[PDB]
Write a protein that binds this DNA or RNA. Sequence first.
RNA 1: AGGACCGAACCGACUAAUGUUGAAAAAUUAGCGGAUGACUUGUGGCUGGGGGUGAAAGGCCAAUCAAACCGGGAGAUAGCU
RNA 2: GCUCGCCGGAAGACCAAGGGUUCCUGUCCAACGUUAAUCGGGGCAGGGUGAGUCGACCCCUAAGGCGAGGCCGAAAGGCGUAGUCGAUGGGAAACAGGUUAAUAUUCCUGUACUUGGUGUUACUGCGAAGGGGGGACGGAGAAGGCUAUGUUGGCCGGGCGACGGUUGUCCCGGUUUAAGCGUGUAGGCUGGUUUUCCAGGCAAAUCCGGAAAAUCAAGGCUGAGGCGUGAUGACGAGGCACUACGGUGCUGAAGCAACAAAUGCCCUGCUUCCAGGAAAAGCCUCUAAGCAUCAGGUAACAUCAAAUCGUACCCCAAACCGACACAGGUGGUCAGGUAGAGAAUACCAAGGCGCUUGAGAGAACUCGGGUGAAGGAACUAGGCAAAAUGGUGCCGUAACUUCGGGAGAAGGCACGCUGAUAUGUAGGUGAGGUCCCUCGCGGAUGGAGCUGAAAUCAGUCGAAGAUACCAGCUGGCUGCAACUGUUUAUUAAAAACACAGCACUGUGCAAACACGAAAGUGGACGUAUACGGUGUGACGCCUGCCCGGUGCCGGAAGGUUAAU
RNA 3: AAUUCCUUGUCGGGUAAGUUCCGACCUGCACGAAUGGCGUAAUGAUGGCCAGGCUGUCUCCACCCGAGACUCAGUGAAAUUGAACUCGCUGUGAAGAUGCAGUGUACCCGCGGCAAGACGGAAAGACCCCGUGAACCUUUACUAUAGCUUGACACUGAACA
RNA 4: CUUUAAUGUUUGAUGUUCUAACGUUGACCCGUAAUCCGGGUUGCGGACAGUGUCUGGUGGGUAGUUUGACUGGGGCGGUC
Lengths: 7, 46, 271
Amino acid sequence: IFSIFVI
Amino acid sequence: MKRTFQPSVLKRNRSHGFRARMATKNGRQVLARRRAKGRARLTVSK
Amino acid sequence: AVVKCKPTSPGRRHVVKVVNPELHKGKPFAPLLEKNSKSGGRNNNGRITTRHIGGGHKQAYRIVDFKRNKDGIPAVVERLEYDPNRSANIALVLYKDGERRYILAPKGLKAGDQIQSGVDAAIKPGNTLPMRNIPVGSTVHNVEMKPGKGGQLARSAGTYVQIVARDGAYVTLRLRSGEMRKVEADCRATLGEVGNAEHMLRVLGKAGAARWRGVRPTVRGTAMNPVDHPHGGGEGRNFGKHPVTPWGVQTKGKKTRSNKRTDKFIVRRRS
RNA sequence: AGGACCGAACCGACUAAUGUUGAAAAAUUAGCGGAUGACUUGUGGCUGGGGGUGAAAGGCCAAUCAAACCGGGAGAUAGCU
RNA sequence: GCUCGCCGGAAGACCAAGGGUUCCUGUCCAACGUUAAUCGGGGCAGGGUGAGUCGACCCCUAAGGCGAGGCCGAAAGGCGUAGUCGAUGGGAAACAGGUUAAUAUUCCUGUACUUGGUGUUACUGCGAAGGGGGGACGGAGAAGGCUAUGUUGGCCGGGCGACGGUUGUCCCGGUUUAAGCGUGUAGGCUGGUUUUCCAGGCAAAUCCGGAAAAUCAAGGCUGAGGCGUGAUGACGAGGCACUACGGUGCUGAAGCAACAAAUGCCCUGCUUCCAGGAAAAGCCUCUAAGCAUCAGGUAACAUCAAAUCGUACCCCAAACCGACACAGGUGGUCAGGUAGAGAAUACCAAGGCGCUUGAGAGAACUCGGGUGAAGGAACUAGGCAAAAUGGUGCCGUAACUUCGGGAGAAGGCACGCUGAUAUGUAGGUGAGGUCCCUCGCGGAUGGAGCUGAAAUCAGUCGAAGAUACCAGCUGGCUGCAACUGUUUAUUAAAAACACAGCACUGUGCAAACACGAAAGUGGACGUAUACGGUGUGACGCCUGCCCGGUGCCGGAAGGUUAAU
RNA sequence: AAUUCCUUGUCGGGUAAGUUCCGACCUGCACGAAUGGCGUAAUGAUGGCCAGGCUGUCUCCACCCGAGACUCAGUGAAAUUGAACUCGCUGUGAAGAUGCAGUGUACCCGCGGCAAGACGGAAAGACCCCGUGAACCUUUACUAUAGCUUGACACUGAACA
RNA sequence: CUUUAAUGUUUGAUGUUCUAACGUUGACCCGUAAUCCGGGUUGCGGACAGUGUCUGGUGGGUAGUUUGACUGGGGCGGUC
Ligand SMILES: CC[C@H]1OC(=O)[C@H](C)[C@@H](O[C@H]2C[C@@](C)(OC)[C@@H](O)[C@H](C)O2)[C@H](C)[C@@H](O[C@@H]2O[C@H](C)C[C@H](N(C)C)[C@H]2O)[C@](C)(O)C[C@@H](C)C(=O)[C@H](C)[C@@H](O)[C@]1(C)O
């Protein structure tokens, strides 16, 4: 693829 | 870092040993299954 | 003597201790001790069943005679002691037959005074008596509820009960709670107010003071997610629920007394 | 005297760089916080799965957690690939 | 083997936990070893763990577990009494030295001790699953006394110097010694002894407890260490031999004093404070039933018994938890010199290591360090990172302040070495000699010898004297949170949580409330100055209006309304 | 303003120059009194702003000492991979071409370097939607239900009014 | 073979009294050296309390589920 990104 | 297995025989036997296993209807069924399965170590004891 | 503390550190700045100089410095009367051992607020099921309980100092149990049977024989109060198990102070006693016991410690206390129990016994602070035999209006502390049972009313520091009337085989008492409860009259009831009183005025002053009285932190309803407790989530404070206990019953006014077995005895409820 | 001060052991984990097929499935180095207390530690005990525990993050309950793991119903059902 | 380098509050040493032959010796090098390997914690074979005293077993119990009957539950089962188990705590006793390739407080030499059985000889009221005593207990602080331990001198043995000097005020080394037994000290605690009486200690008690008198006051426990003995013993620098060059034998000097000195011991003491500090047995004493010539009890000597199981090795690690011979994690014990406040830090000792690929090159780049002209935050989201500050004494220090603080605010000055004051002073320690005496480990006086800071004056070297290591950067304005604390183990440490303080509200005790089909348990061996719940969050000044909605409290009327 | 959209509001201060900061105003899009208001000494690995010192942070990078990188010897991995005889350009084309058209260029093969392309490798998207999908959470959604609470009958009787 | 009213009943509502079911987490006794249980005596409470079946209320405390499609992405709007 984670979910980390752108978006 | 400190990992999950911190060995200690006292606790081992008290928690998983033959007698402990034996002290409960289900603990006994534990053995029963292992015997029927023909297991060579019913419960890893001395 | 209540005493402020000088701010030689925050968390002393606000402290206010009660120092009782006339309290026995030194060890308590050995053969009236039994171990107490802490509860951690936990059941015989291991399940926390009263929250916020844990740690605190060790505490040996002083016995304490609540019943007060030694009628006739008189005793002398050797000394005043601190008791960790309560707000009040206790007085080591010594009856003339050579026997020692633990009484509470009514406002007068003071070493050398003379105590006695029974239907005879001087109307005077510290002497126990069936309320059958205490003059209406007295200020009687630790009071029995069932005659011979023990003494269960007004035992906390500075508390007291006021006998206001006594028709039939019954007495009506004025409990500190302000309730008006009838009681069997044949009940023992030691005379006067109970001590310390000043107990009220301490200020504790810091977090630790609480912890080391065995009190654990209280975590607010609305500081937790929906699954934990009926209160809050909210993306920022938020409430919007009638307040309730973590099991859903409302706090803020809902009475929750249901007895009937003992309603006969309550004359007038508090306010 | 002190949840007092500076500071090793001990307990922590604020910054950075390194490391990212590591020396290591979270560390190393240089700095950093606490350091007589709500401190820290060895041994042993109790709490069990919509249950525990939670100074409260949905945190933790054996490298697993908005419902642990093992076996079972079991070839669940899948108008989808 | 000789150098060199690294740790030395460990990277040395002893264990517990855990492992489970990794120990020692021969032998082999395929596989295991991140390379080679003649080597190994690897293969094969053989060897090795010796106890009345260490530890387990054992007696004793904490948490907690189990639990005859019992209470409860559709079954399974739950809880719990009597009990019975459970150490992380209590409980009798051995030390110095030697020896094995490999164990040793276990074997050997010397010298001890503990508890029972039996016997002899004296002398005696013995006797409980029972009473009482004891065991038996917190935190902080303060010194005194003392040991370990160190330093110097003396003593002993050896040295006369690869290079100018070294017959001396010179160099090197050693100078160690236990339990036990005797003594009972510094010092801690406590008034003893007799007679009588008594509603307490479930019965009993001569014990404990309480009340009277009576008479001497010095009695009694407790107690580090020292001293004597143990000991003509042991160990021992160093010597001489031989060695299959790893080692192995033999012999053997002095072995005193002064000063310093712990975080150890006296001390489970002492002083003080609030948060008020396990249990039970062993032990002592008391008697009941019971036994009275007996049996038992006490002492001296003699003798006999003390089984069984563990004991190798690693143990901050290559032997344990980490899949690895893994830069991680792992509790307890010991702790030398120089400088130092120090268990920091730097260099060393004892001892232990150089980390299981190396050899050369001296590119870019990357990692880790060192220095830099002039400039000095222009960098950048941001001084990120670096750089700087850094010790001790004295002088000196603003707003503000809850009167403590702010403060190490800020900022100054001195600092080495030599001589003198003073051939070594102020101080510390303290032997002789003389007097005193309940004669002792006493005391008074006594001042040798030893030890020895800091100051000032004078002088002197360097660019520099807190010279290395180590070792705060400082100040101004402002948001938030009172503060110490807690948190997302592994992208969030914060303004979040907690907190003391505040308020509302519930709860009369078989409390409310919680776990629980129930029995029961927690709340609490508490009782409204208590307890639960909820919100708020030190402190200061304060907290206004609205009860229509929703909720809660009260409301014996009436309307509507369930089973029946 | 931890609340202000309009907003870099406006005025004052600091700077050569300040969307931040400090002080004010009040037009509070949309503060406000225990889901506390306004203050506050002290504390803080807390947020924002400033200054002295300091400097390789920067102008702008130079040299040096060590560990790799390079060479020899020994041991010896990895992800990925339809198959490869695996160039540039302009164009075509399931629409961004090493592989099609046209054309330009290029003897065969290493080693050290660098990352523009192979819509590079790695995880069957989480965002987006979809399924008569899942789960947890909410409530005056629906239907039930433990709990609490109400009465009737039973256990349960006698008197006198 | 009665409404203006009252003596014997079978029967509700309310109020007093009683003890004898039932409660007792008062006291004492025995099993028994035993804070469990039981028996016993007794005081207190007393046809209440509590419990079973039935029953109206309350009931996110807990559970299972539902919460449309079209749509020039989806939502909102609109439409059916
Ligand atoms: C250290 C070791 C890990 O590396 C990191 O975590 C880096 C730093 C992640 O970036 C981190 C950091 C960052 C910034 O990605 C660059 C963040 O956006 C992502 C979500 O996670 C990467 C790359 C993520 O990929 C990215 O995931 C995105 C969904 C899409 C993106 N893609 C389109 C190109 C893709 O490469 C992702 C999923 O972890 C890769 C998958 C296969 C993995 O799980 C593998 C095992 C990784 O965990 C890892 C290599 O072991």
